[PDB]
Every structure is written in C-alpha cells, then in structure tokens.
A paper describes a structure:
High pressure atmospheres of argon and krypton were used to produce noble gas derivatives of crystals of three well studied MPs (two different proton pumps and a sodium light-driven ion pump). The structures obtained using X-ray crystallography showed that the vast majority of argon and krypton binding sites were located on the outer hydrophobic surface of the MPs – a surface usually accommodating hydrophobic chains of annular lipids (which are known structural and functional determinants for MPs). In the experiments described here, we extend our knowledge as to how noble gas atoms bind to MP molecules, showing that they readily interact with the outer hydrophobic surface of MPs by non-specific binding at multiple sites and in particular compete with binding of lipids to the surfaces of the systems studied.
A good consistency is observed between argon and krypton binding positions: of 35 noble gas atom positions identified in tmBR-krypton, only two—which have low occupancy (0.1)—do not match corresponding sites in tmBR-argon. Moreover, at many positions (11, 13, 8 and 6, for tmBR-argon, tmBR-krypton, MAR-krypton and KR2-krypton, respectively), noble gas atoms replaced, at least partially, lipid atoms, with an altered conformation of lipid chains being sometimes clearly visible. For all the investigated protein systems, we observed slight decrease in dynamics in presence of a noble gas. This effect was more prominent for both tmBR structures, in the presence of argon and krypton.
Author numbering: 7 to 231
C-alpha cells in the first residue's frame, strides 16, 4: 500500500508532538494552564493511535462506487470525531465560552464528521456529494461561530486573550477549510489524486492542525490564570 509511508510518518510526528507537549507541561503548575496542556497533548495522542491503527491495516474498508472497489480508511473519521471537538474546546476555554455554545459546536462538529463518514461509505457516487455538502455547511457554521462570535467574546477580554485567539482563529479557518477540498479531489471524492497523495495531504493538514495549533496555544501567556 503506497500510502503506508505517510501513515508511518504521520504516526511518528503525532507521537513526538504528544510527547513534546507532555514534557513542556511538566514545567507548569497553574490550574488554568494545565487544562490546555491536557487537551492539547491528548489530541495528537489520539491521532498517533489512529495513524498506527491504519498503518497496521485496521480501520480500512472497501466501498463500491463509480464501478470500482474503493479503499476507505474509516479510522480517519474516528480520529477526527474525538480530536476536532477537543480543538474546539481549547478555543472555547480560551475565550471562556458558555456551556450552550460549547454543546452547539460539539453537536455541529459531530454532524460535520458523521456526515463526512456517511458520504465516504455511500455506494451511489452522486449522493456522496450531497453528504459532502451537508458536512461542509456544518463546517461553515462552526467557522462562522469561531470567526464572528468567538472574536467578539475575545475582544471583551484582556488583550493577551484577543491576540492569541485571533492567531488560532486564522489557522483554524485556513486549515479546516482545506479538508473538504482534499476530500473532493481524493479517492473519497472525484479521484483526481490517488490515495497515497490524499493521505500525504491529510497528514500535512492534521500535523499542522494539531501540533502547529498546539505550539501557538501553549507558547502563549493567554493560557495562564
Ligand atoms: C486533527 C484534525 C482536524 C482539524 C480535522 C479536520 C477535519 C475536517 C474539518 C473535516 C471536514 C470535512 C468536510 C467539511 C467535508 C466532508 C469531509 C470532511 C470530513 C473531510
Ligand atoms: C474571513 C474568514 C471568515 C470565515 C468564517 C465564516 C465562514 C463563512 C460562513 C458564512 C458566511 C458569513 C458571512 C461573512 C460576511 C462578513 C461579515 C462581517 O465582516 O461583518
Ligand atoms: C444551521 C444551524 C441551525 C440549527 C442548529 C441547532 C442548534 C444550534 C443553536 C445554537 C445557536 C448558536 C449561538 C452561538 C453564539 O452565541 O454565537
Ligand atoms: C512510531 C511509528 C513509526 C512507524 C514507522 C514504520 C517504519 C518501519 C517499517 C519497515 C519497512 C519495511 C521495508 C524494509
Ligand atoms: C496516546 C498514546 C501516546 C503515544 C506515545 C508514543 C509516541 C511515540 C513517538 C515516536 C518517536 C519517534 C522517534 C523514532 C521514530 C522512528 C521511525 C522510523
Ligand atoms: C503519549 C500519551 C498522551 C497522553 C495525553 C493525555 C493528557 C491529558 C489527558 C486528560 C486526562
Ligand atoms: C448536558 C448535555 C449533554 C449532551 C447529551 C448518533 C447517530 C448514530 C447513527 C449511526 C447508526 C448507523 C447504524
Ligand atoms: C454507518 C456509518 C455510521 C455513522 C455514524 C457517525 C458517528 C457520529 C457521531 C456523532 C457524535 C456527536 C458528538
Ligand atoms: C461550493 C459548492 C457548493 C454547492 C454544493 C452543491 C453540491 C451538491 C451535490 C449534488 C450531487 C449531484
Ligand atoms: C459561500 C461559500 C463559502 C466558502 C468560503 C470558505 C470560507 C473561507 C475560508 C478561506 C480560507 C483559505 C482557504 C484554505 C486553503 C489553504 C490550504 C493550506
Ligand atoms: C499534489 C501532487 C499530485 C501528484 C499526482 C500524480 C499522480 C498521477 C495519477 C493521477 C490519477 C489518480 C487516480
Ligand atoms: C512524493 C513527495 C515527496 C516529498 C518528500 C518530503 C517529505 C516531507 C513531508 C513532511 C511534512 C511534515 C508535516 C508538516 C507539518 C507542519 C506543521 C508543524 C507543526
Ligand atoms: C464500515 C465502517 C464504519 C465506521 C465505524 C465508525
Ligand atoms: C477522549 C475524549 C474525547 C471527547 C470529545
Ligand atoms: C451554513 C452557513 C453558516 C453561517 C451562519 C450565518
Ligand atoms: Kr517514519
Ligand atoms: Kr512524557
Ligand atoms: Kr482532556
Ligand atoms: Kr484513541
Ligand atoms: Kr488514545
Ligand atoms: Kr488497532
Ligand atoms: Kr481501527
Ligand atoms: Kr475506534
Ligand atoms: Kr478514536
Ligand atoms: Kr478515545
Ligand atoms: Kr469536547
Ligand atoms: Kr479549533
Ligand atoms: Kr467546543
Ligand atoms: Kr447543543
Ligand atoms: Kr452534542
Ligand atoms: Kr463530536
Ligand atoms: Kr465518525
Ligand atoms: Kr458537490
Ligand atoms: Kr462526505
Ligand atoms: Kr493562517
Ligand atoms: Kr495555517
Ligand atoms: Kr475553500
Ligand atoms: Kr469547501
Ligand atoms: Kr474534484
Ligand atoms: Kr495540504
Ligand atoms: Kr498546511
Ligand atoms: Kr499552524
Ligand atoms: Kr509547548
């Protein structure tokens, strides 16, 4: 399986990212700051587990569509189901979002990843893209609440919080927006690029969205109470 190279590198970078965050957090006692270390280290730990599972051949299924048997890594969606809500919780704790907003984001993130997977398992080529469209609408709902709602909340807090939140907000909009496009061009969608290139592109986005995001958050004074 040519994609195995990117599964192995993906596992190695998520694993080292998780260990990095844990070692950096050992120099921290602030209760507020520890909550962000715990969440931010768990995200690449979950991704490490799912990349290792896919590398060893677990979390793969064949879906017939477009008159072919198509390899679909469903473990990718299992990873995203747990990690995308932890990343949204990092942002929600930074701007001290209320519990209702937190539930609405988790729910919307559940629809985004759930309909993602339904589309990936859909046997009628055409309907794959209806589910992609619903998943994308849910992502746009999330990015709207983050970009407009959370910025407004962050601007009513201390400037250190507004400043860190804006950088994390900018990275999230850019990286999250790439995912639906990679799905469209990859083996899950139109099959313009082969599985091994889809895997490489998801791996770069995942490492950027977990380790990159995590470095920006945990280097900031905004996480201290
Ligand atoms: C750690 C990984 C992260 C930040 C993953 C993000 C994943 C997405 C934003 C996925 C979104 C998708 C759509 C909006 C369209 C349909 C397919 C998905 C699931 C790739
Ligand atoms: C600049 C990046 C913004 C990304 C988050 C929003 C994603 C798109 C979702 C729905 C459309 C929102 C309408 C945007 C108009 C701008 C309004 C304003 O700046 O006052
Ligand atoms: C499209 C979404 C509409 C239906 C979704 C169901 C429930 C979500 C309602 C939550 C409202 C969001 C308020 C968050 C904020 O204050 O920015
Ligand atoms: C921490 C995860 C690292 C996984 C790396 C896998 C690379 C080793 C596989 C051996 C390759 C066989 C070719 C000979
Ligand atoms: C949630 C579980 C936590 C995972 C921790 C394990 C991560 C291991 C990181 C690997 C370090 C890379 C160094 C050598 C890789 C060689 C690859 C060839
Ligand atoms: C490597 C293993 C990763 C552990 C990351 C978990 C940190 C906090 C979890 C919450 C309790
Ligand atoms: C306090 C609020 C807590 C929130 C609850 C879920 C959908 C699963 C559908 C899968 C079925 C396919 C066989
Ligand atoms: C047969 C395919 C099963 C799809 C179910 C998708 C799981 C969605 C989980 C939602 C969690 C909400 C938070
Ligand atoms: C940026 C494109 C947004 C419009 C989504 C429309 C796709 C619907 C899929 C229908 C399949 C036939
Ligand atoms: C009405 C249609 C809404 C679609 C617009 C999407 C929201 C804006 C996001 C733009 C961010 C840049 C794109 C990211 C790709 C870069 C990959 C690295
Ligand atoms: C980004 C890099 C794109 C490289 C693609 C090269 C593969 C050519 C075969 C295309 C058919 C895919 C099924
Ligand atoms: C077929 C293409 C050959 C390219 C080989 C070069 C391998 C380098 C790719 C590794 C990408 C690492 C992930 C980057 C994430 C950046 C964010 C860090 C935080
Ligand atoms: C056929 C794979 C189903 C995915 C389980 C969440
Ligand atoms: C392992 C924690 C996942 C919850 C979202
Ligand atoms: C699906 C679009 C979400 C934006 C809310 C105004
Ligand atoms: Kr590797
Ligand atoms: Kr550690
Ligand atoms: Kr956590
Ligand atoms: Kr996991
Ligand atoms: Kr895990
Ligand atoms: Kr596994
Ligand atoms: Kr799995
Ligand atoms: Kr799983
Ligand atoms: Kr998982
Ligand atoms: Kr988990
Ligand atoms: Kr969460
Ligand atoms: Kr996020
Ligand atoms: Kr959240
Ligand atoms: Kr909710
Ligand atoms: Kr929910
Ligand atoms: Kr979720
Ligand atoms: Kr899922
Ligand atoms: Kr579409
Ligand atoms: Kr999808
Ligand atoms: Kr960015
Ligand atoms: Kr970015
Ligand atoms: Kr986009
Ligand atoms: Kr998109
Ligand atoms: Kr496409
Ligand atoms: Kr990418
Ligand atoms: Kr990227
Ligand atoms: Kr980043
Ligand atoms: Kr860090």
């Amino acid at each position: 399986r040519p994609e195995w190279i990117w599964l192995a590198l993906g596992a190695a970078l998520m694993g080292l990212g998780a260990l990095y965050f844990l070692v950096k957090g050992m120099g921290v006692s602030d209760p507020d700051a520890k909550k962000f270390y715990a969440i931010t280290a768990l995200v690449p730990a979950i991704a490490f587990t799912m990349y290792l599972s896919m590398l060893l051949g677990y979390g793969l299924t064949m879906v017939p569509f477009g008159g072919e048997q198509n390899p679909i890594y469903w473990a990718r969606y299992a990873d995203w189901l747990f990690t995308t809500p932890l990343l949204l919780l990092d942002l929600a704790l930074l701007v001290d979002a209320d519990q209702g907003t937190i539930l609405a984001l988790v729910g919307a993130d559940g629809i985004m990843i759930g309909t993602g997977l339904v589309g990936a398992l859909t046997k009628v080529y055409s309907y794959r893209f209806v589910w992609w469209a619903i998943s994308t609408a849910a992502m746009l709902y999330i990015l709207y609440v983050l970009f407009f709602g959370f910025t407004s909340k962050a601007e009513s807090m201390r400037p250190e919080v507004a400043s860190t939140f804006k950088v994390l907000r900018n990275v999230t909009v850019v990286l999250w927006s790439a995912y639906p496009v990679v799905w469209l061009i990859g083996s899950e969608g139109a099959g313009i690029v082969p599985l091994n290139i889809e895997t490489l592109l998801f791996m770069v986005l995942d490492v950027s969205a977990k380790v990159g995001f995590g470095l920006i958050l945990l280097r900031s004074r905004a996480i201290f109470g």
